[PDB]
Amino acid sequence: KSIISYNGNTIEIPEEYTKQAPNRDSTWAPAQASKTEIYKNNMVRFEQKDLSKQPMPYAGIELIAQQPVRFVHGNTAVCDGANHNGPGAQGHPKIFINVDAPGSHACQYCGTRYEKE
Amino acid sequence: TNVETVAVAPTILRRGGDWFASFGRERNSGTKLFCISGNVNEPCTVEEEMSIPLRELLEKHCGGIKGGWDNLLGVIPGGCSVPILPKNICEDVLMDFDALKDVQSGLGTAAVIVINKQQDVIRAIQRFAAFYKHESCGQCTPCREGTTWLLKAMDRFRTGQAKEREIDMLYELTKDIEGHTICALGDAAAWPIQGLIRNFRPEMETRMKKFHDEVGAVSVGGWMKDARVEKGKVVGAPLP
Amino acid sequence: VPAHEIVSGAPAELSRNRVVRIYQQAKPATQSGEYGTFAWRLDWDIVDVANRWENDLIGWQSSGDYMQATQMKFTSKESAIKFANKQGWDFYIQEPHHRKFRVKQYANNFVHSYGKLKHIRTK
Amino acid sequence: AEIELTIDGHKVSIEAGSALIQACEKAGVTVPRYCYHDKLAIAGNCRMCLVDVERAPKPVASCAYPVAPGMVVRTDTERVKQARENVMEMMLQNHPLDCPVCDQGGECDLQDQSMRYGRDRGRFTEITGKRSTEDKNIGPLVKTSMNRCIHCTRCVRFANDIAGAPELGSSGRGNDMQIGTYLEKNLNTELSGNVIDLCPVGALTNKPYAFRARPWELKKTESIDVMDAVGSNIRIDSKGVEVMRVIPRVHEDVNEEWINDKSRFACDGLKTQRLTTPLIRVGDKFVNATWDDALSTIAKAYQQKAPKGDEFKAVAGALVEVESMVALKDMTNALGSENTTTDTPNGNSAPAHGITFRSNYLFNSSIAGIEDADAILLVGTNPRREAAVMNARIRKAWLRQELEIASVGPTLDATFDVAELGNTHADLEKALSGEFGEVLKNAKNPLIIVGSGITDREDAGAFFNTIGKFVESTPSVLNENWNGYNVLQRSASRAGAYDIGFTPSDEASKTTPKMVWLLGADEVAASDIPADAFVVYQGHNGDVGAQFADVVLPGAAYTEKAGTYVNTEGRSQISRAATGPPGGAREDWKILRAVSEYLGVALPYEDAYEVRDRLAEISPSLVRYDLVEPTVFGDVAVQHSLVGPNGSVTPSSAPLTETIENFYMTDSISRSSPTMAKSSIAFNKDNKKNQAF
Ligand code: SF4
Ligand code: SF4
Ligand code: SF4
Ligand code: FES
Ligand SMILES: [Zn+2]
Questions:
Q1: Do B56 and B29 belong to one domain?
Q2: Which CATH number does the domain housing residue B72 bear?
Q3: Cβ atoms D492, D228 nearer than 8 A
Q4: How far apart are CA C20 and CA D316, in angstroms?
Q5: B interface test, pick of A78, A90, A94, A117 with most B CB neighbours within 10 Å
Q6: At which positions is FMN bound (chain B) (predicted)?
Q7: In angstroms, rounded to a whole number, what is the distance separating the alpha carbons of residues D426 and D195?
């Protein structure tokens, strides 16, 4: 809401534009600059600008966290992220995930989680 | 050293070298134990002169092949590591090292295994491939990976889920392992496959025709037009 | 030694206040291939103020040093020294280090030990 | 003697019994390999190195096949090309399609040798797919991706033979053979990070470094590690303004191709807690200030304080370069002070081994001298913490030849058998008059290794007396072909500091300073600074001294300057700046030049050439880089410096203690490193992950 600047003056920003993504409040990487820091360091170029028009992509980490775990019989799940509707090669390189250890195990490419059962 | 070469030694020393030389031909001299197993009427374990004919060995010790010499597919002379003998070579072959090597097999441990016309040779070789996959120590890459690849290929050849040119590829696959490994388990693993291809290619071709008519059309690696990856698995295909 | 500095057209600061290094690339610790280690590289030491800084608009790395990405390749240390003298460049030669040779025998992994084993070799 | 053979038509002569791959390398023939490595035992499991030998009927493993006279070898036959393709085909069939996400990508020997020697396309399309492997946790330093493992066993051979960490091994059999610990155990060794270099594939990777860079985008700079006094040669890989990672480079006489985990992973301490602007204390808080403001404040404090003679005390920390120490000493002397101290305990007084001859504070046997050892006495020193790669060197010598090692001091967890003779000076007296003294008398290459931690004791002279007497007697320990007396420094700056005589005068250790200048000095305590004292801190990280300071000056770190460092050997080595310093920080000798001009005493060199001159004035060996030269004064030094002045010293009854409590945090950079803090908690002895039984 109120961000104190290096000048010592106040910048007001609506709460919804301080969120890192519409579906997530906080950063998901140590190197990632937060929205608050971005405004504090770039406010000059945000003056007389409409924040509601700026790009606000959804954070993919929450979206992938919403996908249910796939359960597999053996020791090895196979993933390729393929599009069964289109032609050609539209997924990721086909890899094999070991599910012997307890818990779920994520595809390195697409984040889909597999588990033995 | 082996226990039979050591165990015979005191008898050899007592009776003299010339006497032991008197049995069997040149360079294959003495008397070996000949365990006989498989599809003979009467399995047995016995000792005999080297250079004995195979037909005579079978008929006179084991009661002969179950069904008669007409009903013989093949014989593995020596254990699983040596290439199998077809029906028409064992009618004339002597149980030496020289004679077996000349027909491109070996004496090995003189463990005879006969396979009659009722059994599947492809299944037997597949079982040998499974054995070699289980017995690899895993030290050296050509054996540690090639035995597993050989087992996958033989599982597909057992049901016919393969293309005919892949036989040649399987042959080339054995040459990846042979001569490249630390020890001779790799060569042992390569040999039975090569015997199978050389002697029973048309058997494999028939099984492939049976699958292609029966189930469907197969791509290299055993894939078919309905087969794809779904939620962690491969569906649309048998998966040998 | 001909003073080709004065015919090249390069800035004077290059032959006045810059230092170059002449060396051979070390064998990388990550790989067993040595293909890049035979050439003699010549490249410039960095200048503190002008080397690299963060752009305030998008975050790119700016630079004021026009030599920062330049590297010359020479077939010998002597060719490189000759060229550097002909350009009036102050240089430093970093002599390369090489692996000392020793005799390696596979059989040494199995030498009989007469006393207590110092370690269990495992293979 | 050397024998002779032919390879690809060429004639090569090599020592008898050497492996064929060694002769191929000597004759300039390239042979592909995975499991072979110059520093590990021969394995012969990858089968990539096959060649034809006319006597041999089938291709042989080059790495394990001994050369013989008249041998004829061909590396270029059609059979050899076919075998290379066959082996690569078998290697790639279960390898995961991971290159886009794998950290090895672009510097991968599997990728490169696939390109050079393999098929252009695979044949493996099996519908049952590939083998997959569990991942394994072996601590916070080495991330594992074990699908990629090609079972070369380099990691196991290194962990067992070189580092002495037998927890690593291979379990199971056949296709299910797995590298690991068979149960959850850390790979617990100060040398562990080296396995990341040794792994040909991305199976073992740098965990703090993961996913941050590709090799083609990195500037590579050859420089010198300063985490200890060995002076390991390193390559710093940086991009733009930040340092990405630190890797060893080969110096067969120093670290040979290894570094320790501090040298490898404390680099992340260089991007946090950095000093970027001058600070001035005002009340209980620091305030940012200009350079002009801060230098003026130092000058005004000097005018007010008005130190006479040795009321201006200068302290040099563990990480400083020689040029900075020289400038600081020259300015301090021009102020009338002789109070140039070191940052170690009792460093207010001069060291008891003396400063007159270099051989009184150095590793007089070179580091390479340890290769020749037959008996070693360790006196108050734990090499595994003080000099990790030298500890590995001792272990290698011990493994390959008979060698007797005994130590006086704290019980040490060692990677080689050690004979404990007790923790006291009386124990040392007994030992040098007893059986191990006789061992030393009888040996061909003995050496006595004295720790820098004994120097820091009050009773130090006592020890240096005892050893000295023994050395002055035993010709095997000190004669014209071999000096077996060795002081092992722990800090990269101490040898150079003694080289320039950065040592207090006798009257200076009496005085109570009114002004203290700390140059990278973060071992200082509350007790060592008078309350009324005006404290200037000059450094690159904010750890301890900066907290004590009145004025803080930002200086460059070792990756940001081309400095001189003298290692324990007396070897003078020159580094190269990878990046520039952050923010408003400055090269440290230039800081001292400016502040001396503010103080009236403006120093006589403002250029790098002039500073190197001045260094040559102080000591001619500081400008002779990568060179070690013996002293002609070996006998004089021992009598004049160790036995002479130390007679009066009375030995204490206090036992010798461990010099460094925590290996992982020792200086300001390592104590600024999140990786070092994580590793310090992770690798603690009381944690079952670090306990085999
Ligand atoms: S060939 Fe021999 S050494 Fe190599 S993996 Fe097979 S059993 Fe082990
Ligand atoms: S180890 Fe090499 S070949 Fe394997 S995934 Fe990584 S980069 Fe690719
Ligand atoms: S983890 Fe790496 S170094 Fe260790 S055996 Fe596997 S491939 Fe070799
Ligand atoms: S390098 Fe020779 S077999 Fe591996
Ligand atoms: Zn996926």
A1: yes
A2: 3.10.20.600
A3: yes
A4: 31
A5: A78
A6: 2, 5
A7: 42
Helix locations, chain C, DSSP H: 5-8, 12-16, 77-86
To the question of whether residue B28 is assigned a binding role by annotation, the answer is no
Contact present, D188 and D681 (Cβ < 8 Å) = no
Q: Is D150 in the pocket of ligand 3 (CB under 6 A)?
A: yes
Distance CA D632, CA D359 (A): 10
Which residue type, as a one-letter code, is found at position D668?
S
D69 touches B: beta carbon within 8 Å: no
Test site for ligand 2: of D111, D114, D117, D197, most ligand atoms within 8 A of the Cβ: D111
Q: What resolution in angstrom units was achieved for this structure?
A: 2.4
Cβ-contact B97, B133 below 8 angstroms: no
Q: Where are the beta strands (DSSP E) in D16-74?
A: 50-53, 60-61, 72-74
> Residue B174: which CATH number?
1.20.1440.230
> What is the rounded distance in angstroms from the CA atom of residue C71 to the CA atom of residue C66?
12
Q: What distance in Å separates residue D150's CA from the closest CA in chain B?
A: 8
Among residues D57, D48, D53, D91, the alpha carbon closest in space to that of D73 is found at D53
Residue in B122, B121, B116, B90 with CA at minimum distance from that of residue B103: B90
Contact status of C112 with chain D (Cβ, < 8 Å): no
- What CA–CA distances, in Å, run from D596 to D81, D302, D601? 69, 11, 5
Find tokens 């004077």 and name the residue.
C12
**Host domain of residue D576:** 272-344+491-629
Element (H, E) at A12: strand A10-12
| Identity of the residue numbered D542 | G
Q: Which residues, 6 or more positions from D653, have their beta carbon under 8 angstroms from its beta carbon?
A: D424
Tell me how far the alpha carbon of residue D101 lies from the centroid of ligand 2, in angstroms.
Answer: 9
Please tell me the distance between residue B190's alpha carbon and the centre of ligand 1 in angstroms.
Answer: 12
